[PDB]
């Protein structure tokens, strides 16, 4: 007759949630500003636009 009888479900839920958090911490790109040009920009200056931003 011990408390560990009735805490399996929540401790497992906690482990799963914390594993999800740890994983998503590294793996979701931390970048913003998804910039996009069009197929008419002479890459040779699209390098220059990037260096501008």
């Amino acid at each position: 007759n011990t408390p560990l009888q009735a805490i399996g479900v929540p401790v497992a839920l906690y482990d799963a949630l914390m594993a999800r958090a740890i994983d998503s911490a590294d793996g979701t790109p931390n970048s913003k500003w998804l910039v996009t040009a069009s197929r008419d920009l002479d890459d040779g200056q699209a390098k220059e636009v990037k260096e501008g931003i």
Binding site: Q45, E48, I53
Partner: protein
């Protein structure tokens, strides 16, 4: 002087007007000369050979920045003088770009392309397209795609259809225009 780097014979051969007596030599010269600067002003490139410059400079930003006005040259030191300098200082530009770093501050350099074999084919193709549009398309009627004449029961779509842009002329030169930043 536009006689050696755009022979009227090449124009008369491009626009296929070598048998038109209604385009005299003076008229074609006026077209060729109003289109060698209406689409040079547009690109901001002189066409003469390497042509020195001298101009004032104003530093911008707390970390120092010198915006020039020519994209000077590849590998030749631009030098600064005056403006509290004790000796003319020489910087080296980076190719294509026109930004440098460290009683008005002056600067001198040499812009232009080395040889007299002047403006590349890109520039010329633009002029040829612009001339052709100019000689057989005066501005008197609004057109539509495939030189058709429509109606629209509302405003003509002829917003334009009457400007260099139409010919791939204007857009050719752009290939050499540099999207600032």
């Amino acid at each position: 002087n536009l006689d050696t780097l755009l022979p009227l014979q090449t124009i008369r051969e491009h626009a296929k007007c070598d048998d038109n007596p209604r385009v005299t030599d003076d008229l074609l010269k006026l077209y060729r000369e109003a289109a060698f600067e209406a689409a040079e002003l547009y690109t901001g490139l002189s066409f003469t050979p390497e042509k020195t410059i001298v101009e004032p400079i104003r530093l911008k930003g707390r970390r120092g920045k010198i915006i020039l006005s020519a994209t000077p040259i590849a590998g030749r030191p631009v030098v600064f003088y005056g403006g509290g300098l004790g000796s003319p200082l020489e910087l080296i530009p980076r190719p294509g770009s026109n930004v440098l770093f460290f009683s008005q501050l002056m600067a001198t350099y040499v812009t232009g392309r080395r040889c007299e074999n002047s403006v590349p084919a890109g520039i010329i193709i633009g002029i040829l397209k612009l001339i052709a549009w100019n000689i057989n398309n005066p501005g008197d009627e609004v057109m539509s795609v495939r030189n058709t004449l429509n109606a629209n029961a509302q405003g003509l779509i002829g917003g334009t259809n009457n400007g260099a842009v139409i010919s791939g002329a204007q857009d050719e030169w752009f290939r050499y225009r540099r999207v600032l930043l």
